[PDB]
Amino acid sequence: ATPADWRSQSIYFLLTDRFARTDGSTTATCNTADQKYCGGTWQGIIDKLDYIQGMGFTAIWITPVTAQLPQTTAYGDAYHGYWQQDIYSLNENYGTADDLKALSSALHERGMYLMVDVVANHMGYDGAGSSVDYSVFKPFSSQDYFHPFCFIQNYEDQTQVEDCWLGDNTVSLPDLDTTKDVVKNEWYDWVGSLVSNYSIDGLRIDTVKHVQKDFWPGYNKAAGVYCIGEVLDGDPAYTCPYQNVMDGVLNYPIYYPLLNAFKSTSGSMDDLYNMINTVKSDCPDSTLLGTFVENHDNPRFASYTNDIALAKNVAAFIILNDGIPIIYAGQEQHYAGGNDPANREATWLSGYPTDSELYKLIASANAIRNYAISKDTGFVTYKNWPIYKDDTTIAMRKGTDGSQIVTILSNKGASGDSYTLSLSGAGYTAGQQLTEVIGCTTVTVGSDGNVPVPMAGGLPRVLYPTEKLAGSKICS
Ligand SMILES: *[C@@H]1O[C@H](CO)[C@@H](O)[C@H](O)[C@H]1NC(C)=O
Ligand SMILES: [Ca+2]
């Protein structure tokens, strides 16, 4: 699917090892500290597609599918997929080629997309340096395909970031020489054939900043689908230029101030408001970025705060921001693991309850986003507009005039006081009825055009014209 096709999507990101077992167990042990395969599979995902689609997601992002180093390293198994050795074999832990095709086909039947994580930067090896037997790498079965062995020490030196190795002396990530025509041609052939064999709709590309920029346009073109890059940097002047060589990037610039704004009652709405405006102006296309506050490379939101109101507000932001919302499996069950490996919790140990507070919030937020998009072809290209901030509040507007969603978020938290916020700039007409679609209340626009937004419980408020909800199953 094209970048334009992907703009309206909403992604559920999962670890194949950690989401769903073939046996469907909700009690199979998964001690994250063990860092071992816990037994999630592609068939497991198929069996739980109702759970995911119930939250109004239109797509899933799964972790890489290639065959990994075999060892239980001192850092555990390659359960995560990022330590590949044979790119022409699947990881048999997750199932067969027919299973991965079955998952693509199951998603397609339900009108959903498959996004697959891919690594071009590196292979993985249990050991480092003179220990590496380059013959185990397929097809890059020679030291000649790799950058000379060195570790990245100066992250300020972009040449060392691209040409030196990730990992360490325990588990090294041998760095492919992506400046070599044979390596480019092999990767370009591989990714085009992966996408076509498995009918993949889009790719999440790992470790994009570790590969020189001139590699990526040919990779994106050979894939033939939307590619979203992991450029792990919060500075938009570093990250947003990667959009000149790849369709999209993960919104790490928004991540840091978004997390800060909602993880505590003293969070900066100013820093988030300012970053929305910087990304909107200075990123090639903010509507092709992926918005997130949780992933497998940072502490989960609930590790910072267990306040459920704060988690509801940050989730609503992710769904209603410019670009493609991305929710990490477990976020909807308020998982509170810290850094790797604590944030790789098995989704099945929740029991997959569809009545959890954050399952319901995400379902309501995706419901209005999916509905508004079905009625307003301009929604996904209207750049999100922050119209208000104070110490504890940010309000934003998105969508075509007369159909706009106006969202009011708060970091007051669950003990927040009840009060009316008189909101200017929402762009609705005096006497217009608006539905607050999270709580299903009516708000009427005042004679002066200001919206008397009821605030309470620190809850997020998502407004949409009542008369535009005719025939929708929202708040009925
Ligand atoms: C796709 O399948 C073909 C067999 O037709 C094979 O030539 C190619 O290596 C496969 N590519 C991937 C990534 O599976
Ligand atoms: Ca590299």
Q: Do both 51 and 95 map to the same domain?
A: yes
Q: Do both 472 and 358 map to the same domain?
A: no
Q: Do both 368 and 422 map to the same domain?
A: no
**CATH code of the domain covering residue 124:** 3.20.20.80
Question: 374, 390, 421: which is the final residue of a domain?
Answer: 374
Can you tell me the distance from the alpha carbon of 435 to that of 412, in angstroms, rounded to the nearest whole number?
A: 22
Q: 194 CA to middle of ligand 1, Å?
A: 7
Q: How far is CA 332 from the centre of its chain?
A: 13
**CATH code of the domain covering residue 452:** 2.60.40.1180
Can you tell me the distance from the alpha carbon of 271 to that of 233, in angstroms, rounded to the nearest whole number?
A: 16
CA dist 65 → 13, 30, 144, 423 (Å):
14, 20, 25, 48
Method of structure determination: X-ray
Can you tell me the distance from the alpha carbon of 162 to that of 24, in angstroms, rounded to the nearest whole number?
A: 41
Tokens coding 435 = 């539905």
Which residues are placed with Cβ below 5 angstroms of ligand 2, an ion?
121, 162, 175, 210
Question: 374, 409, 434: which is the final residue of a domain?
Answer: 374
Which of 193, 200, 219 most suits a substitution to test ligand 1, by most atoms within 8 Å of the C-beta? 193
CA dist 426 → 150, 190, 327, 397 (Å):
54, 48, 27, 7
Identify the nearest ligand to the CA of 167 by its number: 2
Task: Determine whether the annotation assigns residue 230 to a binding site.
Answer: yes
- CB within 8 Å of 279: residues ≥ 6 apart: 236, 240, 251, 253, 254, 286, 289, 322
Can you tell me the distance from the alpha carbon of 301 to that of 365, in angstroms, rounded to the nearest whole number?
A: 18
Q: 253 CA to middle of ligand 2, Å?
A: 22
Q: Virtual CA dihedral for 41, 47, 48, 54, nearest 10 degrees?
A: 150
Can you tell me the distance from the alpha carbon of 217 to that of 245, in angstroms, rounded to the nearest whole number?
A: 5
* β-strands 248-249, 59-62 pairing: unpaired
Can you tell me the distance from the alpha carbon of 75 to that of 69, in angstroms, rounded to the nearest whole number?
A: 12
Can you tell me the distance from the alpha carbon of 100 to that of 197, in angstroms, rounded to the nearest whole number?
A: 10
Structural domain boundaries, residue 426: 375-476
Tokens coding 209 = 């900043």
Identify the nearest ligand to the CA of 176 by its number: 2
C-alpha distance across the termini of the chain, in Å: 34
Beta carbons of 433 and 444 less than 8 angstroms apart: yes
The side-by-side arrangement of strands in the sheet containing 433-436 is: 385-390, 393-398, 405-410, 461-465, 433-436, 441-444
Q: 182 CA to middle of ligand 1, Å?
A: 18
Tokens coding 68 = 């990994």
CA dist 54 → 61, 347, 360 (Å):
16, 15, 9
Beta carbons of 310 and 336 less than 8 angstroms apart: no
Tokens coding 296 = 């497998």
Q: What phi-psi label fits residue 59: left (phi over 0), alpha (psi between -120 and 50 degrees) or beta?
A: beta
Task: Determine whether the annotation assigns residue 297 to a binding site.
Answer: yes
Beta carbons of 238 and 231 less than 8 angstroms apart: yes
Can you tell me the distance from the alpha carbon of 340 to that of 348, in angstroms, rounded to the nearest whole number?
A: 18
Question: 374, 398, 421: which is the final residue of a domain?
Answer: 374
Which of 86, 197, 199 most suits a substitution to test ligand 1, by most atoms within 8 Å of the C-beta? 197
Q: Do both 359 and 281 map to the same domain?
A: yes
Q: 176 CA to middle of ligand 1, Å?
A: 21
Task: Determine whether the annotation assigns residue 206 to a binding site.
Answer: yes
For residue 324, the tally of other CB atoms under 10 A from its CB is: 30
Q: How many domains does the chain have?
A: 2
Task: Find residue 172's DSSP bridge partners.
Answer: 125, 167
Task: Find residue 115's DSSP bridge partners.
Answer: 61, 202
Can you tell me the distance from the alpha carbon of 460 to that of 456, in angstroms, rounded to the nearest whole number?
A: 9
Stated as kind and residue range, the H or E segment containing 222 is helix 216-223
Q: Do both 462 and 366 map to the same domain?
A: no
Can you tell me the distance from the alpha carbon of 65 to that of 94, in angstroms, rounded to the nearest whole number?
A: 8
Can you tell me the distance from the alpha carbon of 421 to that of 290, in angstroms, rounded to the nearest whole number?
A: 30
Task: Determine whether the annotation assigns residue 121 to a binding site.
Answer: yes
Q: Do both 282 and 316 map to the same domain?
A: yes
Q: 121 CA to middle of ligand 2, Å?
A: 5
3-state secondary structure of 9: coil
Beta carbons of 384 and 322 less than 8 angstroms apart: yes
Tokens coding 180 = 């070599």
Residue owning the nearest CA to atom 13 of ligand 1: 194
3-state secondary structure of 219: helix
Q: Do both 340 and 412 map to the same domain?
A: no
| Catalytic positions | 206, 230
Beta carbons of 320 and 398 less than 8 angstroms apart: yes
Can you tell me the distance from the alpha carbon of 198 to that of 201, in angstroms, rounded to the nearest whole number?
A: 9
For residue 227, the tally of other CB atoms under 10 A from its CB is: 26
Q: Do both 192 and 304 map to the same domain?
A: yes
Tokens coding 79 = 């359960």
Q: Do both 250 and 355 map to the same domain?
A: yes
Can you tell me the distance from the alpha carbon of 365 to that of 55, in angstroms, rounded to the nearest whole number?
A: 9
Residue owning the nearest CA to atom 5 of ligand 1: 197
Task: Determine whether the annotation assigns residue 234 to a binding site.
Answer: yes
Residue with tokens 């599979």: 41
Tokens coding 358 = 């954050």
Q: Do both 383 and 367 map to the same domain?
A: no
Q: Do both 22 and 150 map to the same domain?
A: yes
Q: Phi and psi at residue 211, in whole multiples of 5°?
A: -120, 130
Q: Do both 103 and 145 map to the same domain?
A: yes
Tokens coding 416 = 């927040």
Question: Which protein residues are within 6 Å of ligand 1, measured from CB?
Answer: 88, 190, 193-194, 197
| Residue 97 Cα: closest atom of ligand 1 | 14
